Amino acid sequence: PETRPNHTIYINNLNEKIKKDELKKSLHAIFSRFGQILDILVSRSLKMRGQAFVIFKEVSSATNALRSMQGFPFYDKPMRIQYAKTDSDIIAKMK
Template sequence: MDLRPSCTIYINNLNDKIHKEELKRSLYELFSQFGHILDIVAMKTMKMRGQAFIIFKEISSANVAMRALNGYPFYDKPMRIQYSKKESEVISRMRGTFVEKGGKKKRPEDEEANKQKKKKTNKPGDKGQRAMNGEVSVPRMEMSTAAPSRQQQAAEQQVPHHILFLSNLPDETNDIMLSMLFNQFPGFKEVRLVPGRSDIAFVEFDTDSHAVPAREALQGFKITTTHAMQIDYSKK
C-alpha cells in the first residue's frame, strides 16, 4: 500500500551498532543537503533499534531525499526509506492540527490562553512545592537536536569544497556522460557514481577553487529536457 507523501520519512535497516548520537549526526549530515530538517528521532530501545524518523520542513524535501537515498549504503547497510504513516507532532503543531491524546484538537490560541491562565493561578514557589509533593512532573533536561537556522544552513551550503554532489540526474546517466561535462574545467579528477543509484553522483576536483567555476557553470544544466542537474558542495 502506497503511503501519502509526508514531511516525515521513516528509515529502517540501519546499523544498530552505531551510537545514537553519532547516528543522528551522520543522518543529519547526509539528509540536510535535501532541505531544512526540523528534527531527527532515533532510539536504541529493542523495538526501535535500527530505525529512525527524519522530519523535514517541506514535503518536497522529504520526497527528494527518499528518492535519492532509498537503498543507499549507510554504515555498510542499505537504507530502506518510506513516508511515515503518521504526521509528526512538530509538524502538527506548526499547522495547528495537533490533537491531544484525549482527542481534542489543540489550537495555538488555546495554548496561549492556558499559559496566561497558569501565570495567574500559580503563585511563586507553588510549582516547586507541588513537584515535591508529586503533583507535577519536573521536565527532564535534554540536549537539543534542533537543526541550524535556514540562514546558517544556506551559509554552510555555500562553503566551497573540492567534491561536488550531483542530484536529480536522469536514469540513463553514466560516468562517461558526466566526465564529458566536467573535464572541460581545470582541476577535474574523477566522477564517482553511487552503486545502484543513477540519480546521484560525486565529482572531484584537485582543489576547492577548481570546483567553484564548474558548479557555477553547470548548475541547473539539463542533461535531458526533464532533469535539471542540482549541484551542491559536499560537507567538509
C-alpha cells in the same frame, strides 16, 4: 509498503551497532542537502531500534530525500526508507 507523502520520512534497516548521537549526526551529514531538517529521532529500544525519523520542513524536500537516498549504503548497510504513517508532533503544531 508505501504510505501517503508525509513531512517525515520513516527510515529503517539502519546499523544497530552505531551509537545514538553519532548516528543522529551522520544521517544529518548526508541529508542536509534536500531540505531543512527539524529534528531526527533515533531510539535504542527493543523494537524501536534499527529505524529513524527524519522530520523535514518542506514536503518536496522529503520527496527528493526518499527517491535519491533509497538503497544508499550507510555504515555498510543499505537504507530502506519510507514515508511516515502519521504527521510528527512538530508538524502537528503547525497545522
